[PDB]
Design a protein around this ligand. Sequence first.
Ligand SMILES: CCCCCCCC/C=C\CCCCCCCC(=O)OC[C@H](CO[C@H]1O[C@H](CO)[C@H](O)[C@H](O)[C@H]1O)OC(=O)CCCCCCCCCCCCCCC
Ligand SMILES: *[C@@H]1O[C@H](CO)[C@@H](O[C@@H]2O[C@H](CO)[C@@H](O)[C@H](O)[C@H]2NC(C)=O)[C@H](O)[C@H]1NC(C)=O
Ligand SMILES: *[C@@H]1O[C@H](CO)[C@@H](O)[C@H](O)[C@H]1NC(C)=O
Ligand SMILES: *[C@@H]1O[C@H](CO)[C@@H](O)[C@H](O)[C@H]1NC(C)=O
Lengths: 262, 98
Amino acid sequence: NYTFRCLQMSSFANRSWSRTDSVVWLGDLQTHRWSNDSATISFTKPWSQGKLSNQQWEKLQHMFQVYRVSFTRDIQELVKMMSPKEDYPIEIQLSAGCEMYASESFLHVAFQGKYVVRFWGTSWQTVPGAPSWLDLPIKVLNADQGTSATVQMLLNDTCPLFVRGLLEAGKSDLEKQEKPVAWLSSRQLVCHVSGFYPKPVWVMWMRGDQEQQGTHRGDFLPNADETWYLQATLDVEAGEEAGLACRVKHSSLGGQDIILYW
Amino acid sequence: QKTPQIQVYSRHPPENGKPNILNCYVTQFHPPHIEIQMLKNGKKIPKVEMSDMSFSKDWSFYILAHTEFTPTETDTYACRVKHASMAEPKTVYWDRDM
Ligand SMILES: CCCCCCCC/C=C\CCCCCCCC(=O)OC[C@H](CO[C@H]1O[C@H](CO)[C@H](O)[C@H](O)[C@H]1O)OC(=O)CCCCCCCCCCCCCCC
Ligand SMILES: *[C@@H]1O[C@H](CO)[C@@H](O[C@@H]2O[C@H](CO)[C@@H](O)[C@H](O)[C@H]2NC(C)=O)[C@H](O)[C@H]1NC(C)=O
Ligand SMILES: *[C@@H]1O[C@H](CO)[C@@H](O)[C@H](O)[C@H]1NC(C)=O
Ligand SMILES: *[C@@H]1O[C@H](CO)[C@@H](O)[C@H](O)[C@H]1NC(C)=O
């Protein structure tokens, strides 16, 4: 169930200083970046154009290029109209895309780090709890029929279509298996598991065949080579270390679990 | 404003004298402007590679810094972070196991 997420981060510092930077993710793999410094959307994979033609890619980029400009002008005009009520600095975040199963699309907008607005059905709406000054700019935005028709097209049609092209074209990278390497250290005993892909994994402290229940699994931390890192810790009496092992199961291993004895 | 969390860990099992990669993963901060340095014996490592800034489901930012490093019996490594949420730079040292 691959979630395709397009993430825009726009910071407005004052009058005439701002920037917008975007990244695009298909599941946990980055497929695009779009720097404020760049006129064009960058590929971060050989397959980042999916099944789109050079021409179709070009149009979709030009629309995003007009959008990035329109967005910036619009937000700056809105602050101007609001003054002094809404003041710089302003942080806007957009998270837009689709999740495949059939599919469902989303476009969520946060302001000052808080979710305020979504596109849903045929219109923009503020979300419950959002500041009331947003109601009138959303109403105005809603009167732009062309934009609503474009956004509906992108969310309902384009996204799922582009992503089925990515899944096909990215298949080799998406379905890649990388093997984890484990090591132990430490009282609290730490089992470090690095370099695995995909994300699902099982790491447990054992005494023979018995899973040690106090095993605290940590957060998944990414490595820079599109693999994962995880630790699992166990608090043990400084009389118990003997006989304990760390066991790792992972799809890449083929039933040959890593077992590391303390 | 949200305060950055910092985790420092290595790509491969650290073994003294063998080249490795040190990661500094900084998460849970807002706003997105931030300065991240990686330190060898408290001195700034110049070659530091950053991922693109991105953000999570709860909207808080994250970013990954990494650098080549060779652990030894005599070198400390750290990640130092400057962010509007904190009055002073926040430094976390590689605990030498991670
Ligand atoms: C798919 C491939 C991956 C590559 C993706 C990389 C980058 C993706 C980044 C973001 C995705 C965004 C999706 C939206 C797409 C829009 C489509 C489009 O073309 O519209 C063009 C339009 C072009 O709009 C322009 O031309 C129009 C002609 O039809 C009108 O004349 C408009 O007035 C004019 O602005 O862009 C806009 O409507 C401006 C954007 C404003 C929408 C943002 C709403 C945010 C809510 C604000 C709440 C924050 C608090 C306020 C602070 C004070
Ligand atoms: C895109 O999909 C959405 C469904 O998510 C459509 O929104 C519905 O449109 C009909 C007719 O306008 C309404 O009666 C429904 O109430 C809408 N659903 C919701 C949840 O608001 C939208 O029409 C689609 N647009 C296009 C162009 O295909
Ligand atoms: C506007 O923003 C940028 C970055 O915050 C800054 O360089 C510039 O000096 C600002 N203008 C001011 C502070 O008057
Ligand atoms: C972002 O790019 C726009 C468009 O070229 C430019 O006007 C603006 O100065 C940029 N912001 C920064 C901080 O570079």
